Design a protein around this ligand. Structure first.
Ligand SMILES: CCCCCCCCCCCCCCCCCC(=O)OCC(COC(=O)CCCCCCCCCCCCCCCCC)OC(=O)CCCCCCCCCCCCCCCCC
Ligand code: HEA
Ligand SMILES: CCCCC/C=C\C/C=C\C/C=C\C/C=C\CCCC(=O)O[C@H](COC(=O)CCCCCCCCCCCCCCCCC)COP(=O)(O)OCCN
Ligand SMILES: CCCCCC/C=C\CCCCCCCCCC(=O)O[C@H](COC(=O)CCCCCCCCCCCCCCC)COP(=O)(O)OC[C@@H](O)CO
Ligand SMILES: CCCCCCCCCCO[C@@H]1O[C@H](CO)[C@@H](O[C@H]2O[C@H](CO)[C@@H](O)[C@H](O)[C@H]2O)[C@H](O)[C@H]1O
Ligand code: CUA
Ligand SMILES: [Cu+2]
Ligand SMILES: [Mg+2]
Ligand code: NA
Ligand SMILES: [Zn+2]
Lengths: 43, 49, 58, 514, 73, 46, 84, 259, 144, 105, 94, 79, 227
């Protein structure tokens, strides 16, 4: 396929931000639940 | 003109491999995971009864 | 009865931009608002009932 | 305007987009459930609780992955986007009924979430067998919410099947016969026929379960002269067709992808591919009791079901070898979609072969209800249906959006997923052969090594899933707009540009009869 | 000074395919022989060798003396 | 009629990549988080 | 058999009206006669508390929970027998 | 502007209201079965009827009043209705399978016999035979109605269609009476289960089919149908013959063979 | 030169080794000197210079075969980044072991395992091939 | 189903048509390279002379490139074909891709 | 036995249904219900492709029973050739 | 008369994995036989073979439930 | 029982389980061959710059692609079905034992002669004796005579369970209202373990099966002492 250059280029720094935010959006809420399992189990 | 892979491919390959090996070796050996390998050739059987 | 289909054809082909579910006139809008209000209100009520049923009751 | 367009749609592309978004969200739910399974099993002992919470997670995992991720993505998403474009049709036959097939799915999913929030959930298995799923061992609303979730998903897909069959039969150019339509269109038509015939039988069976639970019927209760095994027959009469429904559109997408990135104008052996899909669809209705080899059926019945099941390998092998023959002589383009499709050909073959192992009722006595079955079906589902979905997504994302992905990132994603799924499921063959049962929250100590490795593999797949989200973000963030696409002479869905206008084929194609 | 000989120019893909499918077959046979020897026959011999002079009562007495049984002390 | 073209044939905006990141984060993150919070819900019951 | 009628030459409304009034409705009239010659109560059998009948695994969602939806006191005993 | 013959439907809210009606009916049944309340269910039933009314109203506006049902569109609707009927056949097939499974292998709890000990089946030669003649007769009268319409005969179409509807209503009233009079109930083991669930879904389809015929009756009164274009009537007739054939299988299987 | 979105329905240029002569020229508009070059091309090509021949080629085509078929260093980035993210996964597994998983059962203690191993040998678990077959009952040691 | 010689002769005849047009030149070369073969020098000779009649020097060079490409790893085929074509190359003033530097990556 | 009172399509068909009906009577197919019959397809006798705009997609079944259809835009102007079989097509707009 | 009973032998009427009817039939046969004997003036000892077979094959709880229903008058089989 | 890092089947304890091992070896050889052949042909299709993109005739080669797999399937089915019918063949058991599944434990009934029955529950992990196996031991084992053909009848008094002993090649579902039959014959004394094999609720993972195979005389005295 061919394509135009990016209309709004996403620099390496911007990609690192988007990747970090994306990963944290999955990891932080699950990690919070799993970290607190024992708190839940005995209650 | 050199692209990203010409500029950085060697570093990405070398650093990624080094990091991957190091952290998996650490995970596998240093944090108390019980792999439960075969006792064959490894465990000295001990009286139980 | 007499055949009044031509009248209805003229009404529903009027060049007024209305979608077919509203093109009969003001009554269509009323019936639509009733339907959609019952649907959205009923859906909120069902979510309330889920909330209620999700916890034990003495 | 927003509500008119996205809640009141009568447009096949927008509805396909809704289905892709819905399926992607479901895929995250299903992934999270799969990670909870593998967290429970990733070391010996108990993590979450006993088998009830564990099997609510397992049950929901399966329902979400099957009914809310694979079927909506393949049939509702790729089917709606691609089928009308591939036959030059201006939309689906019933473009407003089509919108109701979509909008039944968020309520279906809501019912499933409700089932897990009320009481102690439906910890039944996705097969929902009684009496465990009946009103004594699963008292309360959870199982009935599950049944109603399935009712809505079933209506959604039955009406969708009606739409696709009608569209594909009735709305081709008048010169185009059925043997001039692309293989993906065939794969959807055949899937739709399977849905049309099988889901009403499931509907009957789960309705009988509903009345046994609430109206004091006894279809499945021996105290009334009922039989738990009747439920299993009705369920699996649907459930075997269902796995062919899950893979057939994948087969169709694989044919297009392999043809395209081989630089070929056509797949090898087109009429053999049509024959094979039709044969698989037909045989897929006469094999269901291989799900029941340990229930106590007569030996001659076991012999028949073994034999009929094994026949399916013949048309399926024609498709595998024809994909290989499509690669043969190609100008191979090593695109990310091609990598997904090559991974499919191999890993689907491995999974299909362990299915042939299981078809042998004598061996299935020892393999049934063990992880050997789990390994088998995740080769064909996590490395077959899902690889076809990912290949189709990467291949057609620029058509649907008008923007390109970063191919290097998409290849990185493929690599991570390939390692992760194989690390997850390959060791499960050993766990099955050595006797680890299905649906267990914990295992005898001997099974620890392979469970540990399998759980580590599941976390590698998690990383691939997270990276997929980033990759889609990066594409929409950078806005690299498509210019030229090659091979449009044999890939009509690209010929209206990227993305195609809201209305396409307002003037139909010209195709003469000669 | 010297000119080049005319090489084969037609059917090169087909020739390559034929040669390697034939080689795949030969390797498949080689593997089937290796597997019969290293797996299938090995297993038959292990089970036949084990049971050839097997004394089930002696086995039982060893187990009984080791203390493993509920029903036999 | 409706907007046509890249970035226009979708029910979400892509006009700002950081707003988009937030929306995608909430969208996929909420799906992934839901099973964990349902498990928490069931654990906290009994 | 294959009946014993006749007809055709060119299908029509007149023939199907002929069949409606000349065969179909007379048959309904005959079966209506037959049915109402054999109606009226038959005696209800001794009540026996068979465990495969009068199933109650969950109360019905209406009434007192113990009556079927079209309960007929004359012929439908409860798990404990006929009603007074 | 198009130069094909197919129908680009205006954007419509009824798919969404229909989907939400399904949510309200199913969560309403859950509320009724488990939380002693009919409220959600009544809302869902109401929004379901409103959705069906407006949706099919609009199809009539699109076809009779706006002219969108070209032959290509009508042909699609023919396929759609046939496929819909096929799915309904397979739904009933599951209940026939349940019936034959239980009756051909009666378990010890039944007495190891069919009909079960303590079950006294209805006499298939009384009201069940009457119901059979009623639905068969209605298949004849609807055929008369169809030919009258094609021959352009308004009065006899209306007469034949009215007779068809009356017979459908007669069946429904007879069946309701038989339900009340039956000495066995849905809770009388697998005999009552198969009998009432299978004949009950059939009776629901008789009511649905009768309603569809009544819609056609009022559309005919209002001159919607031409002598050549009347697919709603054809679809209702196909559905009605489906309901008649399902009855014949029920009669032979459950009432006669199963007695 | 410049390819535009609104051009999608027109014949387009592609560099692909199995479609050597694309449907259009790479360069459609000619300058004065490029027009003169296309006139000169109508005479004997022996009178074209090497530079003129190259310029004619680059008017017709974008990349040569050697250019379009060149290999890249992309594989290094792909493999290296895949290993990075696989390595990142082990960080997640380390976190899980530290903060989520509690102690494993007491049956994995060394002495338990040694006793359990003896008992498995006493009941001759898998004595044909799998386990006790690998124990030398006469020498009281694992077979070498 | 037709000898090698009959095949080559059909293709020579195709490119030798005096008034062959640009579309037919491209159709011919783009069809020919789909086959499992490197075209015989006599075919390439006719195609190159068609290029000359069409005043298209660039397509003549491209045709030589596609001969090299169709040989794949058989590195002996292309220098043989060029050898056999040198009289035609000299006569028509066709420079090879190598002579033009177009084999550099 | 046999009065009237049922409208005919001639009397009551409307909209697009009526346009299709009236055109079919004149032997015309403005809404593309029929497959066009091919000409010999030479440059002299090209297939004539009606359009209400200045381009239309053609699908070419190059040989009878080919399962592969070859698709391309046909533009107003000089006749174009199928890229697979060379048969000629010319757009006849309006 | 021809004892040495060990367990219930293969019975060609019930050759398949589902043995429910084998248990049921022998239970009925024993109790039918016992009814005939206790009445007309014979010895239940001629019923013994059926007794041994159903006792071997039938789950205790099935026999117990069937016995209870015979006492109650709710046993649905014919004896 | 299974042992750590086990790759294949537990060692055979009965002749039929030995038959299954040899049949699995045969079938796995075919699985390996076909998978390896597909992987190899993939790599072969992908490793040449030579091309052939014009239309390819399929008729000839599809004969190979259907007849060879049909032959292979027949070569699997023949030994498969032989074992199936061998499993089904009449053997005349010396003993019948019933097992009833329950949430969450098994009961056993030996009622050929005396009314012997007992419950069999998992040993809790905290109560294991040293050297005993977590999740596998029971309090009361299923003592059985070795080298004898035994009829096991399987049912349930609540939900589905399934009675499995992999060593002996056994898995029979436990279905309320149904009495399912299987045959068991151990060539050796010892302890043979299995686990409930149909999801059955909260403790499905924790209701195992332990057979204890001993000489008839020991079984007889054990039986008498269990009354
Ligand atoms: C096929 C999936 C692709 C990815 C595979 C990843 C897996 C890595 C292997 C990469 C290569 C995998 C090839 C199969 C390895 C078989 C290992 C085995 O000893 O299996 C033995 C049997 C049981 O046998 C026995 O009763 C006797 C055992 C004797 C043991 C002696 C010691 C053996 C070594 C112990 C350590 C092994 C640990 C393996 C640990 C593996 C952990 C991941 O188990 C089984 O049946 C397993 C059932 C598998 C059925 C699927 C067949 C797929 C074949 C793929 C063919 C192309 C090659 C791929 C070549 C690679 C293509 C990309
Ligand atoms: C995409 C989904 C999918 C697909 C396509 C399949 C495909 C097949 N499956 Fe699988 N299967 C599942 C998903 C799927 N399965 C699921 C979810 C379950 C478990 C359900 C549950 O209990 O929850 C399951 C369970 C299951 C069982 C029940 C096992 C048990 O519970 O004990 C069996 C038994 O026969 C079976 C067999 C097969 C076979 C023969 C095929 C065949 O279609 C495969 C054919 C393909 C090939 C054979 C490979 C390609 C062929 C060649 C290269 C030719 C040469 C080959 C030979 C000569 C052999 N499957
Ligand atoms: C000519 C009569 C026509 C039937 C009209 C009656 C209302 C039923 C509405 C729907 C009928 C469809 C089948 C529903 C299942 C059971 C109803 C069966 C027919 C019936 O009406 O059965 C009655 C019992 O109804 C009962 O329990 C319950 C009745 C009330 C509950 C209705 C059903 C609730 C469950 C609905 C589930 C729907 C699932 C649909 C899935 C569709 C596919 C997705 C029998 O009465 P009885 O007193 O037991 O015996 C007579 C003794 N004198
Ligand atoms: C509580 C739950 C149950 C509630 C069910 C209630 C009853 C519903 C009864 C069905 C009524 C259907 C009315 C449809 C009217 C619209 C119609 O009939 O539309 C026709 C098209 O057919 C069409 O869409 C055909 C449309 C097909 C309609 C199919 C109806 C049957 C399906 C009902 C649902 C079954 C559910 C079963 C669950 C167990 C209009 O085309 P024509 O007739 O050619 O006219 C045009 C001419 O005038 C031109 O000259
Ligand atoms: C399978 C899907 C999940 C895979 C693994 C997830 C990886 C975890 C990512 C980090 O998650 C966070 O981890 C913290 C610990 O590192 C937790 O903080 C907890 O621990 C901290 C340090 O002890 C305290 O400061 C905090 O208050 C306390 O909430 C925190 O809540 C949780 O969000
Ligand atoms: Cu009992 Cu699982
Ligand atoms: Cu299956
Ligand atoms: Mg099972
Ligand atoms: Na666990
Ligand atoms: Zn053509």
């Amino acid at each position: 396929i061919t394509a135009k250059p990016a209309k709004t280029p996403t620099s390496p720094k911007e990609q690192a931000i988007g990747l970090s935010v994306t990963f944290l959006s999955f990891l932080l809420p699950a990690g919070w639940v799993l970290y607190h399992l024992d708190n839940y189990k005995k209650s | 003109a050199p692209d990203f892979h010409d500029k950085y491919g060697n570093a990405v390959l070398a650093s990624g491999a080094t990091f991957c090996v190091a952290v998996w070796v650490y995970m596998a050996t240093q944090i108390g995971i019980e792999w439960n390998p075969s006792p064959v050739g490894r465990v000295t059987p001990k009286e139980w009864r | 009865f007499e055949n009044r289909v031509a009248e209805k054809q003229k009404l529903f082909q009027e060049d007024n931009g209305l979608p077919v579910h509203l093109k009969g006139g003001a009554t269509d809008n009323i019936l639509y608002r009733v339907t959609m209000t019952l649907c959205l209100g009923g859906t909120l009520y069902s979510l309330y009932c889920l909330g209620w049923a999700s916890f034990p009751h003495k | 305007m927003f509500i008119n367009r996205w809640l009141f749609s009568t447009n096949h592309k927008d509805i396909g987009t809704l289905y892709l978004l819905f399926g992607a969200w479901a895929g995250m739910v299903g992934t999270a459930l799969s990670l909870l399974i593998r967290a429970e099993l990733g070391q010996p002992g108990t993590l979450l609780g006993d088998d009830q919470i564990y099997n609510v997670v397992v049950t929901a995992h399966a329902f979400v992955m099957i009914f809310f991720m694979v079927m909506p993505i393949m049939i509702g998403g790729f089917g709606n986007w691609l089928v009308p474009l591939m036959i030059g049709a201006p939309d689906m036959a019933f473009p407003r009924m089509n919108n109701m097939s979509f909008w039944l799915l968020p309520p279906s999913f809501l019912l499933l979430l409700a089932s897990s929030m009320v009481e102690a959930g439906a910890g039944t298995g996705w097969t929902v067998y009684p009496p465990l799923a009946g009103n004594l061992a699963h008292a309360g609303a959870s199982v009935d919410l599950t049944i109603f979730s399935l009712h809505l998903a079933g209506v959604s897909s039955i009406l969708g099947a009606i739409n696709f069959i009608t569209t594909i039969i009735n709305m081709k150019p008048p010169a185009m016969s059925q043997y001039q339509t692309p293989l993906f269109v065939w794969s959807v038509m055949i899937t739709a026929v399977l849905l049309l015939l099988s889901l009403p039988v499931l509907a009957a069976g789960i309705t009988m379960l509903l009345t046994d639970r609430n109206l004091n019927t006894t279809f499945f209760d021996p105290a009334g002269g009922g039989d738990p095994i009747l439920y299993q027959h009705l369920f699996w009469f649907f459930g075997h067709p269902e796995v062919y429904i899950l893979i057939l559109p994948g087969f169709g997408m694989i044919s297009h992808i392999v043809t395209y990135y081989s630089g070929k104008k056509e797949p090898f052996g087109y009429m053999g591919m049509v024959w094979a899909m039709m044969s698989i669809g037909f045989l897929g209705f006469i094999v269901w009791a291989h799900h029941m080899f340990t229930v106590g059926m007569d030996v001659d019945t076991r012999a028949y079901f073994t034999s009929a099941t094994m026949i399916i390998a013949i048309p399926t092998g024609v498709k595998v070898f024809s994909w290989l023959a499509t690669l043969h002589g190609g100008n191979i383009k090593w695109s990310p979609a091609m990598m997904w499709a090559l991974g499919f050909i191999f890993l689907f073959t491995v999974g299909g072969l362990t299915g042939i192992v299981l078809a042998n009722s004598s061996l299935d006595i020892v393999l049934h209800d063990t992880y050997y079955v789990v390994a088998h079906f995740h080769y064909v589902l996590s490395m077959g249906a899902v690889f076809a979905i990912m290949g189709g997504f990467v291949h057609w994302f620029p058509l649907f959006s008008g923007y390109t992905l970063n191919d290097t990132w998409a290849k990185i994603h493929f690599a991570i997923m390939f390692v992760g799924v194989n690390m997850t499921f390959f060791p499960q063959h050993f766990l099955g052969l050595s006797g680890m049962p299905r649906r267990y929250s914990d295992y005898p100590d001997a099974y620890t090594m392979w469970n540990t490795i399998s759980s580590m593999g599941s976390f590698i797949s998690l990383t691939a899933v997270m990276l997929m989200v980033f990759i889609i973000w990066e594409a929409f963030a950078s806005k690299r707009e498509v210019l030229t696409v090659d091979l449009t002479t044999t890939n009509l869905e690209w010929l209206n540009g990227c993305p195609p206008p809201y209305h396409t084929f307002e003037e139909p194609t010209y195709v003469n009869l000669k | 000074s010297t000119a080049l000989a005319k090489p084969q120019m037609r059917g090169l893909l087909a020739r390559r395919l034929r040669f390697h499918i034939v080689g795949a077959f030969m390797v498949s046979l080689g593997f089937a022989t290796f597997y019969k020897f290293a797996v299938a026959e090995k297993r038959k011999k292990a089970y036949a060798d084990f049971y050839r002079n097997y004394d089930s009562m002696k086995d039982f007495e060893e187990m009984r003396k080791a203390g493993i049984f509920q029903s036999a002390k | 009629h409706y907007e046509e073209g890249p970035g226009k044939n979708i029910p979400f905006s892509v006009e700002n990549k950081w707003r988009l990141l937030a929306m995608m984060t909430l969208f996929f993150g909420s799906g992934f988080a839901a099973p964990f919070f349902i498990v928490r819900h069931q654990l906290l019951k009994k | 058999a294959s009946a014993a009628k006749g007809d055709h030459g060119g299908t029509g409304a007149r023939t199907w009206r002929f069949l409606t009034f000349g065969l179909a409705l007379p048959s309904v009239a005959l079966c209506t006669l037959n049915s109402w010659l054999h109606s009226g109560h038959r005696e209800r059998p001794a009540f026996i508390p068979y465990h495969h009948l009068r199933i109650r695994t969950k109360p019905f969602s209406w009434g007192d929970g113990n009556h079927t939806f079209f309960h007929n006191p004359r012929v439908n005993p409860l798990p404990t027998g006929y009603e007074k | 502007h198009q130069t094909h013959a197919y129908h680009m439907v205006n954007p419509s809210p009824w798919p969404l209201t229909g989907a939400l009606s399904a949510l309200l009916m199913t969560s309403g049944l859950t509320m009724w079965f488990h939380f002693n309340s009919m409220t959600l269910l009544m809302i869902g039933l109401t929004t379901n009827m409103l959705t069906m009314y407006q949706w099919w109203r609009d199809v009539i506006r699109e076809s009779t009043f706006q002219g969108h049902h070209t032959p290509a569109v009508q042909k699609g609707l023919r396929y759609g209705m046939i496929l819909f009927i096929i799915s309904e056949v397979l739904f009933f097939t599951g209940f026939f399978w349940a019936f034959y499974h239980s009756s051909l292998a009666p378990t010890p709890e039944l007495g190891g016999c069919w009909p079960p000990t303590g079950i006294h089946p209805l006499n298939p030669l009384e009201v069940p035979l009457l119901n059979t003649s009623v639905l068969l007769a209605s298949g004849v009268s609807i055929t008369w109605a169809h030919h009258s319409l094609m021959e352009g005969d308004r009065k006899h179409m209306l007469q034949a269609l009215f007779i068809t509807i009356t017979l459908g209503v007669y069946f429904t009233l007879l069946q309701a009476s038989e339900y009340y009079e039956a000495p066995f109930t849905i809770s009388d083991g697998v005999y009552g289960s198969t009998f009432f669930v299978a004949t009950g879904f059939h009776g629901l389809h008789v009511i649905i089919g009768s309603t569809f015929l009544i819609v056609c009756f009022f559309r005919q009164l209002k001159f919607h149908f031409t002598s050549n274009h009347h697919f709603g009537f054809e679809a209702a007739a196909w559905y009605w013959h489906f309901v008649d054939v399902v009855w014949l299988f029920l009669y032979v299987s459950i009432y006669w063979w199963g007695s | 030169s410049v390819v535009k979105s609104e051009d999608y329905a027109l014949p387009s240029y592609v560099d692909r080794r199995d479609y050597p002569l694309p449907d259009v020229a790479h360069v459609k508009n000619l300058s004065a000197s490029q027009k003169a070059l296309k006139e000169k091309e109508k005479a004997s090509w022996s009178s074209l210079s090497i530079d003129e021949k190259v310029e004619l080629y680059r008017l017709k085509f974008k990349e040569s075969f050697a250019e379009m078929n060149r290999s890249t260093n992309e594989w290094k980035t792909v493999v290296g980044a895949a290993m990075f993210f696989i390595g990142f996964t082990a960080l997640l597994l380390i976190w899980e072991k530290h903060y989520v998983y509690g102690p494993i059962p007491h049956t994995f203690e060394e002495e338990w395992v040694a006793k359990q191993t003896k008992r498995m040998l006493d009941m001759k678990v898998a004595p044909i091939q799998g386990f006790s077959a690998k124990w030398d009952y006469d020498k009281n040691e694992w077979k070498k | 189903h037709e000898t090698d010689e009959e095949f080559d002769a059909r293709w020579v005849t195709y490119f030798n048509k005096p008034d062959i047009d640009a579309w037919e030149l491209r159709k011919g070369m783009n069809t020919l390279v789909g086959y499992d073969l490197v075209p015989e020098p006599k075919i390439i000779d006719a195609a190159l002379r068609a290029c000359r009649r069409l005043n298209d020097f660039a397509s003549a060079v491209r045709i030589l490139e596609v001969v090299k490409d169709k040989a794949g790893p058989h590195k002996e085929i292309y220098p043989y074909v060029i050898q056999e074509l040198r009289p035609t190359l000299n006569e028509l003033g066709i420079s090879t891709p190598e002579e033009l530097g177009l084999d550099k990556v | 036995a046999s009065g009237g009172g049922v409208p005919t399509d001639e009397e009551q068909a409307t909209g697009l249904e009526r346009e299709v009906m009236l055109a079919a009577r004149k032997g015309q197919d403005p809404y593309n219900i029929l497959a066009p019959k091919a000409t010999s397809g030479t440059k002299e006798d090209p297939n004539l492709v009606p359009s209400i705009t200045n381009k239309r997609i053609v699908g070419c079944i190059c040989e009878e029973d080919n399962s592969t259809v070859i698709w391309f835009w046909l533009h107003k102007g000089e006749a174009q050739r199928c890229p697979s079989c060379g048969t000629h097509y010319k757009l006849v707009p309006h | 008369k021809i004892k040495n009973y060990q367990t219930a032998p293969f019975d060609s009427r019930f050759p398949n994995q589902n043995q429910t009817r084998n248990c049921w039939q022998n239970y009925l046969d024993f109790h039918r036989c016992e009814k005939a004997m206790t009445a007309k003036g014979g010895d239940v000892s001629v019923c013994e073979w059926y007794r041994r077979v159903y006792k071997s094959l039938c789950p205790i709880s099935w026999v117990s439930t069937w016995d209870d229903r015979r006492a109650e008058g709710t046993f649905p089989g014919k004896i | 029982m299974a042992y750590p890092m086990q790759l294949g089947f537990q060692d055979a304890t009965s002749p039929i389980m030995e038959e299954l091992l040899h049949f699995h070896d045969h079938t796995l050889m075919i699985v390996f061959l076909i998978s390896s052949l597909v992987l190899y042909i993939i790599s072969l299709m992908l490793t040449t710059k030579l091309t052939h993109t014009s239309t390819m005739d399929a008729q000839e080669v599809e004969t190979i692609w259907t007849i060879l797999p049909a032959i292979i399937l027949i070569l699997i089915a023949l030994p498969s079905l032989r074992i199936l019918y061998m499993m089904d063949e009449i053997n005349n058991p010396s003993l019948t034992v019933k097992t009833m599944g329950h949430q969450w434990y098994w009961s056993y009934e030996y009622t050929d002669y005396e009314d012997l029955s007992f419950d069999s529950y998992m040993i809790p992990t905290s109560e294991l004796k040293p050297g005993e196996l977590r999740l596998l031991e029971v309090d009361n084992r299923v003592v059985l005579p070795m080298e004898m053909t035994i009829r096991m009848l399987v049912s349930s008094e609540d939900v589905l369970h399934s009675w499995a002993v992999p060593s002996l090649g056994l898995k029979t579902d436990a279905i309320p209202g149904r009495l399912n039959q299987t045959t068991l014959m151990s060539s050796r004394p010892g302890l043979y373990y299995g686990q409930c094999s149909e999801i059955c609720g909260s403790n499905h993972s924790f209701m195992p099966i332990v057979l204890e195979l001993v000489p008839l005389k020991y079984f007889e005295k054990w039986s008498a002492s269990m009354l």
